[PDB]
Every structure is written in C-alpha cells, then in structure tokens.
Design a protein around this ligand. Sequence first.
Ligand SMILES: O=c1c(O[C@@H]2O[C@H](CO)[C@H](O)[C@H](O)[C@H]2O)c(-c2ccc(O)c(O)c2)oc2cc(O)cc(O)c12
Ligand SMILES: O=c1ccn([C@@H]2O[C@H](COP(=O)(O)OP(=O)(O)O)[C@@H](O)[C@H]2O)c(=O)[nH]1
Length: 453
Amino acid sequence: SSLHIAMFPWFAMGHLIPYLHLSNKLAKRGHKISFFTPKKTQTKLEQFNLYPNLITFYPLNVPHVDGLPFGAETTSDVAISLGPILMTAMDQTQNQIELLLTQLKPQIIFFDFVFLPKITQRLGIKSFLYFIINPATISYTTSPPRMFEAENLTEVDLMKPPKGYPTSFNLQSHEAKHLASTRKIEFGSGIPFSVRSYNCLSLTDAIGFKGCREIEGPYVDYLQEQFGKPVLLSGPVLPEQSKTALDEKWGSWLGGFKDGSLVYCALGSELKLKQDQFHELLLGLELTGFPFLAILKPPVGFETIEDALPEGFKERVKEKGIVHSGWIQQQLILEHPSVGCFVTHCGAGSITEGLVNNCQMVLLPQLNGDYIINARIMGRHLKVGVEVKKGEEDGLFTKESVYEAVKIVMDDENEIGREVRSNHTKVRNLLLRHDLESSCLDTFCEKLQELVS
Ligand SMILES: O=c1c(O[C@@H]2O[C@H](CO)[C@H](O)[C@H](O)[C@H]2O)c(-c2ccc(O)c(O)c2)oc2cc(O)cc(O)c12
Ligand SMILES: O=c1ccn([C@@H]2O[C@H](COP(=O)(O)OP(=O)(O)O)[C@@H](O)[C@H]2O)c(=O)[nH]1
C-alpha cells in the first residue's frame, strides 16, 4: 500500500533539492508527498517537482526573529553567521507545522533539526530524521560517546574518532579546533549545535540517510548500534532530470571549448570566501592555463565580483575564464562534455553530482564538518579526487596548491590523475548500476512500511 509522507527539510537549497529528488522517486512508486517549503522559495522548487499530482507543496511563513534579514527564507539569503537565527525561525514554525499535521494526517514526516517527535507521537505520526549529510559526519561528532564528554570535549579529543567508529582518517589541527568550538555555539533558540542534532537522534522514531550500503554502510551500522533504532538508507539520491534545459547562454559558451578541457569550480550556494583565498583560488585556476568557469559569491567585504578580482585578472583571462555570482544549473553544467575538472567545496549534493559524471574531482572542502569529512572520504578512502593542501594551523591554501591539484588530475600522463579517474569510474559504475538505487529504495520503502506497522 502507498504511504502518505510529509517532508520538512531545513531551509537550505542543499536540503530542499535532495529532499525533492527523493520525493520524486517515492512518488514514482505511488507514495503521496506533502512537501513543506518556505513560501517564496516554492517558486524556485517547482522545476524539480516531476509528479505534481502526488507531490503537493504547502507554504510556510518564515517568522520574524530579531537579527534575521527581512524576507529571508533560506541559508542562501543570509550570511553563514546568521544561520542560527534562521534556525530560531524554523523552531518558530511549530504552530503552523502542528496545524498542517492535524489537517493532512501523514503517516510519516521526514525532518531536519527540529527536535517535532513529541507532536507527531501525540498525533500518531512516525517521526523520521532524514539526513542528506554524510553519516560519517554525524557518527564522528554526535554519537553518544562525544555528547557525554559535554564541555570537556577538546580539539585533541576531536583529532581521534569516537569509541567504536568504523573507519580511520586524519583531521588537521585547525579542523579539530573548528569542530571543538562550533559544536558548542547556539544554533537556534539557545540550543548548542551538537546538542540539537543529538536531541533529534535521541527523540526520533527512526533515522535515515542519503547513501548506499557500499559506501555509507559502516556509518549507518555504527549509528544503529549506538542509538538502538532503525537507521535507514534511501539510496544515493541520484539527481532527477529537470524540466528546464540548460540556459542557452551557458550552453553556447561551454560549447566553444574542446571536450574535457574546462575546469568548473563552485563552492555551493551558502558560503563566501575571504578575499585573500578568493584571490589565491582564481590565480591558481589562471595558472593552469585551462578555460574555467568559477561560480562564487563576492568575497567577504565586497559586493561585486569585479571589485574583488586580482589586478589585471579580466584582461589576462579574456574569454577563457568567467567568474560568475548567480545561481546556475550546476547539474546540467557538470554533464556538459566541455567539463574536465570539478573543483568542489565537497558539499554532499555537489559530490553526488560530480561522482555520477566524468569530471575529475579536485577537493577544496570549506570549513564545515561534513565538507571536511566528505573530502577525507573522497580523497583517502574512495580515492576519487585530489585534495588541495591547507596549512595545518591556519587552514589556508596557496594558488600553487590549487594549480598543482588541477594540473595533476588534468594531466593524462600523470599516474595520480589516471588513478583517481579509474577509481571515479568504479564509483560511478557502482552508483549508476541498474539495480543499485532501485534496490536501495525497495529496502527503504519496506522499512518505512514496517515503521508505520
Ligand atoms: O553540516 C552539518 C549539518 O548540516 C549543515 O549545518 C550547517 C550549520 O551551519 C548549515 O545549517 C547547513 O545548511 C546544513 O546543511 C548538520 C545537520 C544537518 C541536518 C540536520 O537535520 C541535522 O540535525 C544536522 O549537522 C552537522 C553536524 C556536524 O557535527 C558537523 C556538520 O558540518 C554538520
Ligand atoms: O549555483 C548553484 C549552486 C548550487 N546548486 C545546487 O545546489 C545544491 C548545493 O548542495 P551542496 O550540498 O553541494 O552545497 P551547499 O550549497 O548546500 O553548500 C546542489 O544540488 C547543486 O547542484 C545549483 O544548482 N546552482
């Protein structure tokens, strides 16, 4: 029988988009989806709704919170430092969420962040905490062994995995320092960041993650053993095709370059670089001599790309490089045959989009636990990309380190480049295997049915 599932993702494009990809896959199997979205953002989401008769959007008014910029609805609307205020606004949607659940009466609600399970169990609805970040990240920072240390968890503590963690990788000093401090910072309604997610993990009926057994399996197993409740896998949430073909302006421009010759660089929809690293990144791309398309916000303190470019940059790169601030159809750009290299901030959505395509991956994780852990897994475990080197204590890169990583992967005679290409091909063949995503969804839907039994 078909399930009625409500979707309540965090107010961020990197959560809304894969939640909607998954919504489409579930609607193809006959399930009815009630998709909760901030009101103005719904217009930008319609392009991803392939089953409008089964997936219905329900708008949420993002409430005012002192400090939240007027009209803001997603993390793409606010500086990263204002994310906690947007979380307070999510928390404050509780009244309109309660109303929606009582009228719509879904069997299950998928959610982020809102530690909701008390309301749903009052209403006889099953709560499902559904992550689109890596379960390796949650396992590393939010498993019970980490939370019982409370404020005694130091940077030295975070240089080791928690007890029982299933794999090994290394963090740099500045990364463990970042994890140790930001963990304690309030993220919405006075709740420390890791406490919030741990409360969600503890109070929800079941947990799910984007991913497959072959890659995410050890982490989901560890989390199931630690929290003693089902931790499901949805499959890798392969991107669905959009109803909008590639913008002719980009299609024309990309089509002027030889196959596999262009370096595409994008650091997602949320973050802004500081000027000095913006300069180092752009000079590093220029040094390679390959054509490039860099999708970047103007750096901190600047309002236009033009004002922040290194001196003489436009004049030198001419028509071979574009640095662009606006939202583009990244999934369609990565499919274009001109693209030979993807310099990625290692957001989990961008990683999936890179892996299912042919571009060589250069890993430039920004300062966020999931980006860093995705980068270590991709660079050291799957070995599908080359990571740009950062200073151990300062977390900064040089233009020469960007140049070096791109040069390695784009050099047909470089054996590291050939290696990461071969490994990437193996991972793409896995993720696109004719029965991989379907058998993940088969198991996923069987366990959701068990949950509502
Ligand atoms: O990046 C992490 C992350 O997601 C991001 O969190 C950012 C906070 O600044 C932004 O909000 C951003 O948009 C969002 O994607 C979540 C998270 C997601 C969904 C949940 O339901 C939830 O409970 C937790 O947990 C983490 C836990 C870590 O220890 C380290 C991490 O790096 C993350
Ligand atoms: O200009 C842009 C920026 C991002 N994306 C998409 O937005 C999502 C970003 O998710 P990810 O986890 O990679 O990064 P975030 O933006 O959340 O840091 C992915 O599906 C990207 O394809 C896009 O289409 N155009």
